[PDB]
Design a protein around this ligand. Sequence first.
Ligand SMILES: NC(=O)c1ccc[n+]([C@@H]2O[C@H](COP(=O)([O-])OP(=O)(O)OC[C@H]3O[C@@H](n4cnc5c(N)ncnc54)[C@H](OP(=O)(O)O)[C@@H]3O)[C@@H](O)[C@H]2O)c1
Length: 279
Amino acid sequence: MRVGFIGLGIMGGPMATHLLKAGFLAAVYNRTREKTKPFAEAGVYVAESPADLAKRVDVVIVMVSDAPDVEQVLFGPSGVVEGARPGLIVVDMSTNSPDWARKFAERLAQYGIEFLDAPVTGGQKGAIEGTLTIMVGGKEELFHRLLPIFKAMGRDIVYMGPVGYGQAMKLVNQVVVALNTVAMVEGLKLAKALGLDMDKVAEVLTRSGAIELYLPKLLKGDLSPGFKAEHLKKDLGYVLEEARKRGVKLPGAELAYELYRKMVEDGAGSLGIHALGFY
Ligand SMILES: NC(=O)c1ccc[n+]([C@@H]2O[C@H](COP(=O)([O-])OP(=O)(O)OC[C@H]3O[C@@H](n4cnc5c(N)ncnc54)[C@H](OP(=O)(O)O)[C@@H]3O)[C@@H](O)[C@H]2O)c1
């Protein structure tokens, strides 16, 4: 049960800290060395590469931005695959798609490495409080074996099914999240235009996850992530790719994509998704 954690971002940092607190964290990896520093200060081994990390643990969790970043971390010249022994389990917790999850699992099995896709919901607040919802695709036996590890980071732990099914469920989640977030921003734009009392607006509206998590920041003009707009943009692209594959029309998701693609183009990709139309 030794875990190595790769990617110490906004979600990754507090997630890895939960695992450390639970006694599971043995090693961390970050592209940018500085973020490993509080882990080194707590005696966590800081790896020189994902391969160096993989050599030393039984489970590798990946919490990195997008699928190409997962590819690099797993399959690059000093990727996980170069240091892993057969039997290692890889758990991808960031967000991509069912097709990516299945390609990761296929490529990994060539090395005798097991794979689960376990993306999460609950944002930065959930990661910090260890109350994340976790939605898991892969072998059902591995789900059960990793449950104590998942319980260290979240609360509602859900087995979705075969590989790819965690990502599926996350893409469904992201559709809801994008539109709930657009729903809020548009509400507030109209409230502001109608000269309404923000304290009262907040009272009446508080309803969705987005409003609960982001309204108090928005009202303060704190535009910081939170969850990065460039990340929602990637998530929605995966959403529309899957919708196209299966001939479902999601014109809401398509508009959300455009709006977030625009925010990225405008140079606000690093702001919270809640900053849409206020940046
Ligand atoms: N924040 C949320 O609300 C939230 C909620 C659920 C899921 N997610 C998903 O979780 C994932 C991470 O989110 P985050 O908010 O933690 O993002 P973030 O704060 O931007 O962190 C991104 C992390 O990925 C690392 N990274 C990126 N590309 C890499 C590469 N090619 N090689 C190695 N490391 C790489 C970054 O390293 P550096 O430190 O060197 O930049 C950083 O540790 C994303 O898939 C996101 O969509 C986010």
